[PDB]
């Protein structure tokens with residue numbers, strides 16, 4: 029009977045659940061043709077994590093593992109294969125009912141970040157301390173060599189030789205390498221977690237409005253670029269702090285839809301209302317695409333459990 | 344009186360409040376000679392943020408601003424002067440009662456990360472990013488005055504007058520010449536000026552107690568080392584305390600580290616009002632504990648409470 033609640037956090041106090049970025053704006057895009065089925069930032073209102081979702085902000089689009097060897101690839105750069113474990117260092121068991129190790133990226137693109145290594149072996153003359161190195165790196169999640177569900181991925185570097193075989197390796201995500209057509213950025217296209225031509229499994233379900241006039245409402249962040257033109261964004265269904273809150277609370281869901289109000293604390297006024305659905309996503313009554321222009325002190329407050337029949341006041 | 348609580352998170356579900364890293368181990372170091380007065384991950388038990396502490400995990404050791412000038416180093420490398428704003432993009436007001444913009448690094452060292460830029464003008468805007476280092480012990484590190492410097496291996500491709508973000512990744516080095524000391528504060532306004540508005544130092548006050556830290560290992564760009572960053576409370580505890588703002592009923596809470604499987608208490612600790620832990624331990628090093636363990640609030644006690652030795 030534990031009452032359902034959301035944390036009290038302005039947009040300026042929230043972070044994206046699909047890439048390590050602050051939330052910049054609320055956003056809608058009603059004419060989206062893609063199926064929306066992201067795998068990070070997936071949590072039911074009663075606290076069940078789904079997809080590849082995990083709790084750490086540092087785990088989103090991160091990998092841990094070991095480089096095996098440099099490998100040939102037709103594409104530009106120097107390429108390296110790495111085995112991947114769970115983020116906690118334990119071996120990834122492909123028989124677990126998840127799509128891929130938790131935290132694995134959930135979109136097609138060239139993810140830019142830093143690969144770092146801290147050697148296992150230490151040197152006596154260096155105070156029994158290990159050698160280290162880090163370099164910029166790109167992981168193309170659409171590559172046939174992106175196979176995290178099989179425990180292996182590949183990354184490329186500008187650096188031509190200074191990556192060590194057999195050593196503990198971390199990928200820290202930073203942004204995208206490019207959003208040119210040839211870099212295949214599509215935030216709603218899932219990677220093939222086991223490779224070219226295989227079917228993904230254990231997915232969090234797709235989400236959609238079902239009531240006429242309603243559209244999804246997203247928490248949008250702008251993602252950095254290594255180069256080229258663009259202002260790319262990543263849209264999540266709920267911020268990471270909501271994932272963290274719902275997981276902690278695990279309040280029973282008393283219907284399939286929670287009515288929430290976006291409120292301005294100063295005025296006490298409701299700016300608009302939204303449906304927060306059981307599977308963990310928002311809809312609003314809006315007939316346009318683009319940002320929601322709202323006071324910076326605003327946040328969502330739980331109002332009451334309603335049902336799928338409920339008619340939202342238009343934004 | 345809203346009851347005081349901690350989140351229910353294992354070590355493997357926590358992140359560091361002083362650098363964007365997962366928590367690796369609990370750690371003690373009783374013989375520490377330095378004053379411990381970190382400025383990130385500072386929050387009272389009743390939810391008052393202190394020092395340079397802010398809520399976003401993405402804001403810890405981050406900067407936002409614009410580059411104003413390129414200055415070449417004497418030997419190797421290129422430096423760039425950068426004006427900094429608040430992380431929310433508003434102008435930083437030096438008259439506000441904080442030591443520096445929230446999220447500013449709180450230790451001496453060469454912080455390694457990536458500088459990225461997305462131009463204002465455009466059509467789609469142009470972008471660039473490069474590896475960068477910020478030497479927080481440099482005379483040019485003056486975030487409280489609104490300006491810092493970073494260095495790059497890249498010699499030319501950093502633009503002036505364009506929105507710039509620093510994403511922290513690790514340290515550049517921990518060699519002698521790189522001045523890494525996690526307990527030495529930067530001089531936020533430069534070397535001849537006193538830091539102000541600081542979160543207070545923390546220490547045990549009872550014989551046989553020592554501070555208990557949440558430790559993370561931090562990546563290195565190069566060199567030998569296994570550097571760590573120790574925080575007083577993880578970022579999720581800061582976030583939780585801020586949310587709850589439960590009244591503190593004494594100056595010291597008693598907490599128990601429990602194995603929820605067996606239900607047994609592994610050890611107990613004092614959680615002090617100002618937001619830090621002490622334990623009765625007379626050794627340095629990691630705490631060896633079951634991966635399922637976490638801290639649970641027990642009761643309010645006082646400075647004279649004797650902790651069970653661990």
Ligand SMILES: C[C@@H]1O[C@@H](O[C@@H]2[C@@H](O[C@H]3O[C@H](CO)[C@H](O)[C@H](O)[C@H]3O)[C@@H](O)[C@@H](CO)O[C@H]2O)[C@@H](O)[C@H](O)[C@@H]1O
Pocket residue numbers: 159160161162190564565566567
């Ligand atoms: C211990 C050592 O640490 C790193 O080497 C740096 C070295 O880095 C340069 O040379 C290496 C190859 O030796 C790579 O190409 C780097 O890209 C270069 O920057 C220099 O920085 C020297 C300067 O005193 O310090 C060394 O520590 C690392 O790259 C090595 O793999 C190795 O782990």
